[PDB]
């Protein structure tokens, strides 16, 4: 059972990577809370197609080279309420099925 752990007040790291097989051109990516559902993400935590209205103040960030397929999620200043399954989902254009990763985050008290 793969679980990713962070301690309260730290930043969590949830790895997520895809093959950038459509070069140069943007690729839909979502992250949400809960296992990946039928389509896209449930309970979306961040956007990758454009910057959110409160971009600067959000705790959710993609700090990797997402251009090169690193869409790993940072969750800043975690609390116990952050524990749960997260969905990372990528749709390379034309693909038969999205690639869907369910990532389990366990926050531990400080």
């Amino acid at each position: 059972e793969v679980e990713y752990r962070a301690e309260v007040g730290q930043n969590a790291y949830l790895p997520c990577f895809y093959t950038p097989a459509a070069p140069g051109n943007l690729v839909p990516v979502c992250w949400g809370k809960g296992a990946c559902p039928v389509f896209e993400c449930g309970n979306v935590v961040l956007r990758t197609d454009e910057r959110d209205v409160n971009y600067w103040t959000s705790r959710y960030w993609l700090n990797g080279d997402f251009r090169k397929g690193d869409v790993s999620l940072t969750i800043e200043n975690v609390t116990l309420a952050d524990s749960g399954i997260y969905c990372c989902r990528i749709q390379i254009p034309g693909i038969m099925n999205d690639e869907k990763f369910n990532l389990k985050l366990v926050i531990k008290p400080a």
């Epitope: 943007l26 839909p28 990516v29 979502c30 809960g34 559902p37 039928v38 389509f39 896209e40 993400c41 449930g42 309970n43 979306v44 956007r47 990758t48 197609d49 454009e50 959110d52 989902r89 749709q91 999205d98």
Partner: antibody, heavy 123, light 109 residues
Framework: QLQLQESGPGLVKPSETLSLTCTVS??????????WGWIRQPPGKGLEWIGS???????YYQPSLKSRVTISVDTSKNQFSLKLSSVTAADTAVYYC???????????????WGQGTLVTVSS | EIVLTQSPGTLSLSPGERATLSCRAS???????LAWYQQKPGQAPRLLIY???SRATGIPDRFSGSGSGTDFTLTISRLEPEDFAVYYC?????????FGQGTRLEIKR
């Protein structure tokens, strides 16, 4: 309130491409946690989902139509569009655009809808 | 795909009575992810119920949805003449999204 409005030809020749546009007013077609769909209704028949595109760009299609269907968004114009190639009389229908959201959990009910536009495929 | 079969195909009831419309699925519909629509003549479908049992905003209390697994109902109590319409169910628990073929409800007089 969001309002949707279909536009495009009412008559298309067999083997040519059907193109429709949906213009969205009263809200942004790029708002988080919305999806935008095309659903058609042959005369006297029921409803068939054609496909949807999410605010984030994720697109999903009716499998039997995927090889012929393109759905895309123009955020500059607040419009989304449908192209259906190689049409036959099977594609005669009222075509609706529709939207759903804002969703928390995944959902894919539709409300509101456009008004519908009839396309007849005939020579 | 999940095929939705509505019954009866046509219904004719007096105002003030209760209509019970059935939607039955070829396989279990995940998470009660079933919606109901009302389609009046010449109009787009109007969402009544989502998630099997949640009323859409602006929909009167006399519309109710229930059911699970493969058997879902729409109930319209205290029928009114303006309830004449074709009613459709929709599932979104799996792709492709699918709809039933409709029940036509006539209001007697």
């Amino acid at each position: 309130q969001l309002q949707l409005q279909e536009s495009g030809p009412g008559l298309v020749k067999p083997s040519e491409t059907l193109s429709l546009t949906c213009t969205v007013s009263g809200g942004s077609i790029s708002s988080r946690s919305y999806y935008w769909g095309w659903i058609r209704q042959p005369p006297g028949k029921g409803l068939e989902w054609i496909g949807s595109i999410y605010y984030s760009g994720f697109t999903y299609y009716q499998p039997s139509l995927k090889s012929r269907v393109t759905i895309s968004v123009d955020t500059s114009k607040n419009q989304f569009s449908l192209k259906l190639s190689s049409v036959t009389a099977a594609d005669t229908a009222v075509y609706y655009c529709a939207t759903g959201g804002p969703y928390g959990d995944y959902a894919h009910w539709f409300e509101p809808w456009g008004q519908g536009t009839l396309v007849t495929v005939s020579s | 795909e999940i095929v939705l079969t509505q019954s009866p195909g046509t219904l004719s009831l007096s105002p003030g009575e209760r209509a019970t419309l059935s939607c039955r699925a070829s396989q279990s519909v995940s998470s009660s992810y079933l919606a109901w629509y009302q389609q009046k003549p010449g109009q787009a479908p109007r969402l009544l119920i989502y998630g099997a049992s949640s009323r859409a905003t602006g929909i009167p209390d006399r519309f109710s949805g229930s059911g699970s697994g493969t058997d879902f109902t729409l109930t319209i109590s205290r029928l009114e003449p303006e309830d004449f319409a074709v009613y459709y169910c929709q599932q979104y628990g799996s792709s492709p999204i699918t709809f039933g073929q409709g029940t036509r409800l006539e209001i007697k007089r």
